[PDB]
């Protein structure tokens, strides 16, 4: 698994 | 380092790429690393990951079942399924597919949140998303729990 949060984060 | 490789493989052959469907070349390479690495995914997973980045901003992919396909797939992977769906849900990815509201309602359900996968289902019936039936269908099994 990854982490959701730091990975949609990273899309900005 | 392999992983990043293939990135970078595939990154380099679409740069070469003249052509109308770059969702159609990334397929090609991301079934390939799926029927040459069940061991680590690893690949995939870097694979879809940068496939989110690269058709984030891609308008006319956000309702391409393909893209859809791989974004399901690419939940698998993700540690935060409400937040993933949400975020998929309102940047406009799969809000006309059946399978999305199907998919993230029917984790809310197994999560024993039935109001919420409630609203979910009745939206994407809402915005008509396709197979219109099929959602309708899902949303009735659904009812039959209340």
Known sequence: ?12 | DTPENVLQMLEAHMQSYKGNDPLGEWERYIQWVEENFPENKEYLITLLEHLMKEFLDKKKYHNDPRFISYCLKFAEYNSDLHQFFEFLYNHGIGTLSSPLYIAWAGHLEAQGELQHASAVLQRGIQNQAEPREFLQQQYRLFQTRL
């Open chain 1, 1 to 12: 698994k990854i982490d959701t949060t730091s990975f949609l984060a990273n899309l900005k």
